Scaffold this active site. Structure first.
Site: not given
Ligand code: A22
Ligand code: A22
Ligand code: A22
Ligand code: A22
Lengths: 258, 258, 258, 258
Positions: B45, B157
């Site tokens: 990511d 996140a």
């Protein structure tokens, strides 16, 4: 225009209701509690919630207004000293309408409910275990005290106490929070609250016991022989009559900050 | 069709990139890292986030795709063993496009940034104190370690670690979480995360010190002589190229549950 | 009896200090800021913390007293209007002594520190990753913003903001809380705060980067080439001079409830 | 030495019990479930909890041992494949004793209970409101779903799910956590968990409704016409028979981390 008025039932509230009715007697305005177009609730948010469920079959034909006789409410947002100014402004459609999203709950053995705040699920004894399925996909097995599914305006209520986010009610969504989940090396839940858009279906399915205490706003009913509980953002909305600007985030500040 | 490929820069990733380029050499397909229409990120990511910021001036003309060479990613959601199947499907526009909301940050002394995950604010020394203004209304005075404003896809996140809700990325919104707020009888914050719709403006204003460390995804810059930090849902979106169904909530389950 | 007085350094505090010194001039009492037996702090908890660290080499020979010139403190628990009553009672050892536990921190490359509130650890850049070893046993690998180790009296401070429990200071213990841990299917921390008794050793060890910002109460120092950070309940205690009953839980109520 | 054995009641557990009894038949060892000195529980932590309450009138004369036939337990910490090694070591007092603190609950209309994990309090209908008094001092008015008071070894159980700290069981203490408290500008609780030493008394008193569902470990009883619920660290302890080192924090790691 047809109207009715619910009251908390203490002296302050009953007397205020009688005065507004007298004030309405001076206008092209008739009291009808069978087919009102305006529903005024005097008391607190509990009184307002009852007003809502009293007329949930005519949500599309009603504008709701609340007066808080005690502390400030999220739904009841006029003070009593402004009751006469309110009667006047209502007299000539001097107002715009604001709509909030609602939550549809379906209990299958179908019984269906609308919630303005939330619907929760707990066990009847008894340990609570349910499989949580999102749009037909198995997401998690929840073991704990229970689960809460909140509308946007309900996010300031029970949702808040469970660690949930506060959502602006212009967002057409619902929010699922956990109550005391067991998490160990074997048992696993997401932990975080989850926010779903319209058209997403969250389904709860029993694992062993099939009796649950299910709540919808104030109503709480023990349901037996349940096969499924289904949550989704309702197609229907609550409509409020608005006479001045009182923004949601200001409502939140006034209630929680100072 | 024009395309480019970024790589994490380890052997696995570089070799995979060279093979896809060779695979693309067999089709009506040219490598262009100045004006690509397809941007493939190979790695994690973090690699994907860099790919995004590398081409943030051409977001409306690009479709992004990610390959995760290690563990499963939220942005990088093909495996390496499926690289050849991916080259083929990309060859003939065999795909639909999905768009995710982004976050606009503005720093006034104007500097402007886009974030795909989040932007955070902390102090440089030094105690952090800011006034939080929502749509010009003073909402709270925050005292603590800092604040985080997350996009919907960013909610898995840093937002998640701070107690925030996980939001489905089809909801055009941003979410503000606290980092270690001081709450005592005198100092008061809301505590709860807050979810804002498009067109709401959250502004942070200094109280005494005007130097802050501000982060936008991976980038972290000490800003001096700040007068305002402004957050809002961006008018711009990230576009993903999608070849099969891989629903967000399944992505969440796979990453957090099992 | 030897005594000294620290002041916050604003007019209120400096003037109050000069009056107490004049009041002490009428008794068998001498001002000595090199070897005091009584140390009076006038201001807030920050002033009190500084008083403590100013004389941390003579903790066993000192009784500390605090006056809060602003809002109520946890350490500073007389008001200014009671300053003259305090001077009098101190004149003839009219008091019992109460002792609170302290925290020993050791940084190995040995540097050693005492904390009355807490010591924290964060990264210098830069992602923070540490292995957490309890009594030589590998307990967890922590990935996140940082960690905080609090004394019992420190539990009302930063510890509280991180979700920690409030501990009665008669319990000889320390408490470890997380700052924003990453938890996904691969990365795992305990989440919960942890409360350790005397003689338990919590050791933090680097994984890759070996530079950390380490805090001890107000002091914050970037440490380079660290091999270990070791926490344990200190053998040493802070001694307070007590003239009346003001129970901890009442102190907590007064500060946090009303 | 006198001994007895409880079993979960599935085939695995019953068969294991019959084999240990046969193994004990070869030693100076007699089965007595009226006045045992050793009580062996085979199953899980629920089986162990039942074993404890079965013999709570003889806690000072018993050493408890647990075998976990399924996943690892906090109380049941031998595996079944080590049953024969356990029978042998028990034969000749080859063991030291470890003691854990317990929780005394008193319900006044006096009924008294011991808990090894925790005791909780919820409403019977019905909104839950109680005044919380610590050592005769009014600390807070709690409005919410309920409260939980946990022993140190109970801190890994329900306490953990409510956000509580994990406490090493050598600390003679109890820990109070909230279940979904209402906190708004008017209603205020501490939020944080609270850790009390021996000799501190936490008393809960009704405000309006006086019927509560009260739990003590597995037992859950609706109590009517309650005037007070009183919590304190018990004078009595549970004694474990220990044959090898298996530290608490390792037990926690094994159960929650990996
Ligand atoms: N444990 C816990 N924590 C927080 N909230 C809870 C809890 N249990 C129930 N509830 C909430 O209480 C309501 C039940 O309604 P009611 O009949 O009033 O009963 P109650 O138990 O009286 O409601 C509890 C409180 O919640 C207030 N309330 C109701 N709606 C809201 C919203 N939308 N935002 C903020 N505050 C709100 C209400 O205001 P009010 O005082 O009526 O003006 C009360 O102060 C239910 O829908 C839940 O959301
Ligand atoms: N304390 C703390 N807790 C949680 N997350 C944090 C924290 N500090 C920073 N971050 C996150 O880390 C990124 C920085 O990106 P990066 O360059 O990768 O640096 P990193 O510090 O390496 O990122 C930290 C981890 O977060 C993962 N990540 C990144 N985006 C997401 C989303 N959207 N959902 C779930 N997990 C995600 C990433 O995956 P990946 O391993 O790259 O496939 C890493 O495992 C930042 O945007 C934050 O959201
Ligand atoms: N993010 C965050 N949240 C909560 N607390 C923090 C945070 N960051 C630092 N701190 C605390 O601040 C102190 C630094 O001391 P200082 O020099 O005062 O600096 P500050 O940044 O000024 O301290 C922050 C506040 O914490 C108060 N404080 C200090 N000790 C305690 C205890 N034991 N209980 C309750 N409140 C307390 C202090 O009181 P005071 O106002 O001095 O009477 C301040 O109001 C540090 O030891 C931390 O415990
Ligand atoms: N909502 C919720 N979250 C977490 N824990 C809860 C909850 N509700 C009840 N409980 C706990 O469950 C027990 C009831 O005991 P039981 O008869 O077993 O019933 P259960 O509902 O079966 O217990 C729930 C689980 O808690 C485990 N448990 C029991 N004691 C502990 C300790 N000390 N640490 C860690 N895990 C433990 C037990 O292990 P086990 O599987 O028996 O080896 C179960 O897995 C009660 O004392 C509570 O502490």
């Amino acid at each position: 225009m047809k109207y009715m008025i619910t009251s908390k039932g203490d002296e302050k509230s009953d007397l205020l209701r009688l005065n507004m009715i007298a004030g309405f007697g001076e206008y092209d305005m008739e009291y009808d509690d069978v087919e009102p177009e305006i529903v005024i609730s005097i008391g607190g948010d509990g009184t307002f919630l009852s007003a809502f469920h009293q007329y949930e079959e005519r949500l599309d034909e009603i504008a709701f207004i609340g007066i808080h006789t005690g502390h400030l409410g999220f739904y009841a947002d006029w003070r009593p000293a402004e009751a006469d100014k309110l009667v006047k402004l209502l007299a000539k459609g001097e107002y715009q309408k604001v709509s909030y999203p609602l939550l549809k709950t379906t209990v299958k053995y179908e019984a269906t409910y609308l919630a303005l705040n939330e619907s929760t699920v707990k066990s009847s004894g008894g340990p609570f275990v349910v499989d949580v399925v999102i749009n037909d996909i198995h997401f998690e097995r929840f073991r704990g005290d229970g689960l809460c599914m909140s509308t946007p305006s309900g996010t300031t209520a029970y949702n808040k106490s469970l660690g949930g986010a506060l959502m602006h009610p212009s967002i057409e969504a619902m929010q699922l929070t956990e109550m005391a989940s067991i998490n160990n090396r074997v048992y696993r839940t997401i932990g975080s609250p989850l926010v779903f858009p319209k058209h997403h279906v969250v389904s709860l399915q029993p694992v062993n016991d099939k009796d649950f205490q299910i709540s919808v706003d104030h109503l709480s009913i023990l349901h037996r022989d349940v096969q499924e509980i289904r949550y989704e953002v309702s197609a229907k909305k609550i409509h409020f009559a608005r006479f001045r600007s009182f923004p949601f985030w200001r409502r939140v500040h006034d209630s929680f900050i100072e």
